[PDB]
């Protein structure tokens, strides 16, 4: 039993590589960021372009939605993050403190904190209300590739090209667990599972791994795609069948069975590296985005 994702829309408008796509928690919008310094908003169901949000001085690596589906945070090469009111398009706050490119960001579930990771090798935790940096974590010894809060915001996971994944206590900023691998390949992406018990980590040896971080045990490995250079976003798909979804440097979206680890679908259509994928919160819909030869976002729909 396999999904049957088929192409529904191709969304054009970005003028450089797309860097990230994320669905709103309420499912109605997709937000995308790009090396073109812009955030764009698109209808999730009809793929209709809604608006452009501008203000950053350099390219944007990541965007993320608050739980209310109306604030967005973005991470830019201009060394800042910005918090935006999507309704108005206005920048509410600029979060200053990183000393180099900001690569990744996320709100906590409560929507009162933002976590960021940077080329400066640090993870920062920011107060949404005041825009002040609450904590600077000396997290890694190379750029931070991803940061993600768990289900209740009590923990942060971070990854780095230094080859480590680390689990942090949010309130105290303490490192509770370092996950290591002999051979030490750069970790290009990480996120918690929906229940918070596992982390899914991508390494630049063409491998995704599902870890029980408390036990330091690797439970599943997903292979067969190409990932040797970029932070490529991966996802747990949970609306129908239980899948793992990722982009790939061979221009395809890969979908695996979470339990069996078999590749169940490869989605063809992009003409450059698929840098980012996102899974819709309630429908069997995937968004995918690609680098400069392509510059488009695609929306795909499945029966399961």
Between vectors from CA 39 to CA 272 and to CA 250, what angle results, nearest 5°?
A: 15
Structure tokens at 60: 């944007």
Q: Which residue has the tokens 């999730």?
A: 44
CA pseudo-torsion sign 10, 15, 17, 21? negative
Query: Taking the CB of residue 185, how many other CB atoms lie within 10 A of it?
Result: 15
Alpha carbon 74 to chain centroid distance?
Answer: 11
Any idea of the CA torsion for 85, 300, 193, 227, to the nearest 10 degrees? Answer: -100
Name residue, tokens 């069996």: 260
Cα separations in angstroms, 14 against 51, 109, 159, 215: 12, 29, 28, 43
Cα-based torsion angle of the residue sequence 112, 118, 120, 122 in order, rounded to the nearest 10 degrees: 50
Task: Tell me what percent of the chain is helix, strand and coil, each rounded to the nearest 5.
Answer: 0, 50, 50
How far apart are alpha carbons 178 and 172 in whole angstroms?
16
Q: By C-alpha distance, which of 18, 136, 124, 126 is closest to 71? A: 126
Strands (E), 130-284: 133-137, 144-149, 155-160, 165-169, 175-179, 187-192, 199-203, 207-212, 217-223, 234-237, 243-246, 253-257, 263-267, 274-279
3-state secondary structure of 183: coil
| Structure tokens belonging to residue 163 | 């080859």
Q: Are 296 and 1 in contact (CB under 8 A)?
A: no
Round to whole Å and give the CA distance between 300 and 69. Answer: 22
- Give the resolution to one decimal, in Å: 1.8
Show the tokens assigned to 232: 């490529």
Q: Residue 100 carries which DSSP code?
A: S
Per the structure block, which two tokens stand in for 15? Answer: 């003028």
Give me the architecture of the 1-304 domain, per CATH: 7 Propeller (2.130)
**Deposited experimental method:** X-ray
Ramachandran angles phi, psi of 24, nearest 5°: -65, 150
CA atoms within 13 A on the CB side of 91: 16
Report how far residue 289's alpha carbon sits from residue 83's, in angstroms, rounded to the nearest whole number: 22
Count of beta carbons in the 10 Å neighbourhood of residue 303: 10
Using only C-alpha atoms, the chain has a radius of gyration, in whole angstroms, of: 17
Strand partners, 30: 23, 42
Give me the residues paired with residue 161 across strands.
Answer: none
Q: What contacts 28, CB < 8 A, 6 or more positions away? A: 43, 44, 45, 69
CA distance 30 to 24: 6
Strand ranges of the sheet holding 123-127, from the earlier edge strand across to the other edge? 102-107, 113-118, 123-127, 133-137
* Cβ atoms 149, 156 nearer than 8 A: yes
What are the structure tokens assigned to 251, written together? 């221009």
Tokens (6 digits) for 126? 């920011």
The DSSP 8-state label assigned to residue 153 in this structure reads: S
Closest of 63, 62, 60 to residue 71, by C-alpha? 63
């Amino acid at each position: 039993v396999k999904p049957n994702y088929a192409l529904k829309f191709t969304l054009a408008g970005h003028t450089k590589a797309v860097s990230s796509v994320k669905f709103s928690p309420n499912g109605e919008w997709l937000a995308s960021s790009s090396a073109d310094k812009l955030i764009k908003i698109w209808g999730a169901y009809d793929g209709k372009f809604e608006k452009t949000i501008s203000g950053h001085k350099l390219g944007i690596s990541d965007v993320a939605w608050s739980s209310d589906s109306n604030l967005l945070v973005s991470a830019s090469d201009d060394k800042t993050l910005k918090i935006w009111d999507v309704s108005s398009g206005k920048c509410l706050k600029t979060l200053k403190g990183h000393s180099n490119y900001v690569f990744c960001c996320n709100f906590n579930p409560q929507s009162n904190l933002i976590v960021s990771g940077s080329f400066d090798e640090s993870v920062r935790i920011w107060d949404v209300k005041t825009g002040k940096c609450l904590k600077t974590l000396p997290a890694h010894s190379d750029p931070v590739s991803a940061v993600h809060f768990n289900r209740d915001g009590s923990l942060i996971v971070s990854s780095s090209y230094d080859g480590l994944c680390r689990i942090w206590d949010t309130a105290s900023g303490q490192c509770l667990k370092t996950l290591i691998d002999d051979d030490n390949p750069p970790v290009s992406f990480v996120k918690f599972s929906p229940n918070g018990k596992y982390i899914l980590a991508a390494t630049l040896d063409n491998t995704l791994k599902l870890w029980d971080y408390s036990k330091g045990k690797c439970l599943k490995t997903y292979t067969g795609h190409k990932n040797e250079k970029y932070c490529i976003f991966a996802n747990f798909s949970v609306t129908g069948g239980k899948w793992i979804v990722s982009g790939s440097e061979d221009n395809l979206v890969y979908i695996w069975n979470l339990q069996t680890k078999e590749i169940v679908q490869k989605l063809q259509g992009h003409t450059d590296v698929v840098i980012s994928t996102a899974c819709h919160p309630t429908e069997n819909i995937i968004a995918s985005a690609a680098l400069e030869n392509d510059k488009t976002i695609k929306l795909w729909k499945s029966d399961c």
